[PDB]
Amino acid sequence: SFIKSLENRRTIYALGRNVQDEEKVIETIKEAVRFSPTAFNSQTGRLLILTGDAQDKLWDEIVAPELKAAMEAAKLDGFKAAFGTILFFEDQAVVKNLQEQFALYADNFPVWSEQGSGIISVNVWTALAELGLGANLQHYNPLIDEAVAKEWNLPESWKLRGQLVFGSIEAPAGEKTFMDDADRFIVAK
Amino acid sequence: SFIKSLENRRTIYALGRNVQDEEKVIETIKEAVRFSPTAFNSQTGRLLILTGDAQDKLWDEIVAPELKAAMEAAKLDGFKAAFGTILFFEDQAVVKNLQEQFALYADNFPVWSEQGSGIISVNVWTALAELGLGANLQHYNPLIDEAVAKEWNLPESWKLRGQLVFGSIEAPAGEKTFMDDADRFIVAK
Numbered sequence: 540s541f542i543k544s545l546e547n548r549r550t551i552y553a554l555g556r557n558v559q560d561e562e563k564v565i566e567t568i569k570e571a572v573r574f575s576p577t578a579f580n581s582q583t584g585r586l587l588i589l590t591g592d593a594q595d596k597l598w599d600e601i602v603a604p605e606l607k608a609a610m611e612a613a614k615l616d617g618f619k620a621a622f623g624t625i626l627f628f629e630d631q632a633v634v635k636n637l638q639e640q641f642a643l644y645a646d647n648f649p650v651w652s653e654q655g656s657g658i659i660s661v662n663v664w665t666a667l668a669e670l671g672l673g674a675n676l677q678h679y680n681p682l683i684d685e686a687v688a689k690e691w692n693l694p695e696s697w698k699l700r701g702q703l704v705f706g707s708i709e710a711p712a713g714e715k716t717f718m719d720d721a722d723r724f725i726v727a728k
Numbered sequence: 729s730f731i732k733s734l735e736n737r738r739t740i741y742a743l744g745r746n747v748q749d750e751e752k753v754i755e756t757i758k759e760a761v762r763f764s765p766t767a768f769n770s771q772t773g774r775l776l777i778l779t780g781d782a783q784d785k786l787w788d789e790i791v792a793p794e795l796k797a798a799m800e801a802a803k804l805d806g807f808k809a810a811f812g813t814i815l816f817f818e819d820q821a822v823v824k825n826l827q828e829q830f831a832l833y834a835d836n837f838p839v840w841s842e843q844g845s846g847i848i849s850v851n852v853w854t855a856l857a858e859l860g861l862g863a864n865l866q867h868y869n870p871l872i873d874e875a876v877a878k879e880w881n882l883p884e885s886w887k888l889r890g891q892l893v894f895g896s897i898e899a900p901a902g903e904k905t906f907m908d909d910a911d912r913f914i915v916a917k
């Protein structure tokens with residue numbers, strides 16, 4: 540079922556490169572984003588999908604040095620060891636255009652775009668889990684934004700929101716608790 | 729498949745009350761939220777699920793008058809005609825607590841909570857579509873926030889984000905276009 544697909548998506552930190560069909564993975568990522576709703580069908584999400592040498596470069600040559608430099612003012616190997624990283628961005632040029640066209644809702648578009656980023660991130664994450672791949676969601680934005688845009692020649696309007704590290708599952712998800720239903724759901728007739 | 733479930737979720741404006749098993753609907757809504765990821769497992773989403781008399785009251789006694797009063801400074805019947813409305817909130821008391829506990833990430837929690845709201849909204853929406861029910865997502869916040877909190881005795885900390893109107897499908901979704909893949913996906917190796 541759909542609910543089963545949701546339940547099967549988990550944060551997996553222990554990731555490897557035992558990925559059988561990279562083309563199918565890419566196809567699935569694209570479909571998960573394609574079929575995600577966005578306010579006014581604005582489709583503000585943008586993805587940079589890195590594998591292979593690009594995956595190694597992101598972690599060794601961008602994240603590690605940017606983090607070290609930022610600290611002066613391990614886990615990184617576990618992220619590198621994964622098959623790839625999907626960097627999720629929101630296109631600010633579209634957001635701004637919508638704000639101008641519908642000034643009535645100018646304040647809403649940034650909010651809906653942020654919601655949109657969450658939406659496409661989890662849809663991709665869950666789609667990957669259905670292929671038997673694990674993933675985890677990181678936030679090294681805004682630290683790495685400039686270096687990523689330069690290395691892969693991204694438009695200035697792409698605002699980095701999240702990095703979904705993915706690969707073969709090499710150890711199970713940890714334990715997870717849930718709130719009491721009574722504290723978050725109220726049903727009235 | 730999961731991708732098929734995503735594709736099957738659409739905005740349906742023509743909604744009715746031909747709903748066979750309300751208990752199953754409520755169960756599915758809860759599960760879709762339960763199995764949605766949130767930053768640090770913070771589970772900030774809160775739902776008010778209205779059906780029957782409460783559904784009629786929301787639209788006739790709250791949304792319509794608040795909208796009319798706001799205008800002085802149709803579609804509403806189509807929303808009322810639906811089986812119910814799921815009001816999605818984010819708990820600001822939890823957000824604030826997280827900001828205090830992890831001041832390092834204080835700026836991130838509001839963002840992740842907004843993303844969280846998008847995540848649980850679409851997961852619920854898609855779960856409902858799998859039951860054969862349609863839905864559409866409205867934004868009469870912040871106009872109706874006070875009246876809703878008073879009528880259903882909600883905590884002040886619940887910040888309304890969206891209203892998912894749902895019911896039986898009485899007319900098909902409209903047409904929808906998609907961007908060129910080349911404009912939103914970049915793959916690098």
Ligand SMILES: Cc1cc2nc3c(=O)[nH]c(=O)nc-3n(C[C@H](O)[C@H](O)[C@H](O)COP(=O)(O)O)c2cc1C
Pocket residue numbers: 548549550551657675676677678712715764765766767768769770840841843844847
């Ligand atoms: C908006 C959002 C932001 C998150 N931020 C991070 C992060 O920066 N680093 C990380 O390791 N996990 C992050 N998480 C993962 C959550 O902590 C995880 O989803 C949650 O604990 C539930 O566990 P599960 O993913 O195994 O279901 C994030 C999840 C979401 C939805």
Ligand SMILES: Cc1cc2nc3c(=O)[nH]c(=O)nc-3n(C[C@H](O)[C@H](O)[C@H](O)COP(=O)(O)O)c2cc1C
Pocket residue numbers: 575576577578579580581651652654655658737738739740846864865866867901904
């Ligand atoms: C964050 C978000 C906000 C939206 N806001 C509204 C809204 O206020 N009113 C409405 O009728 N539809 C709204 N939509 C619906 C979108 O316009 C719709 O999802 C999009 O056009 C794609 O069509 P689909 O839902 O049929 O796939 C919203 C969708 C999302 C994800």
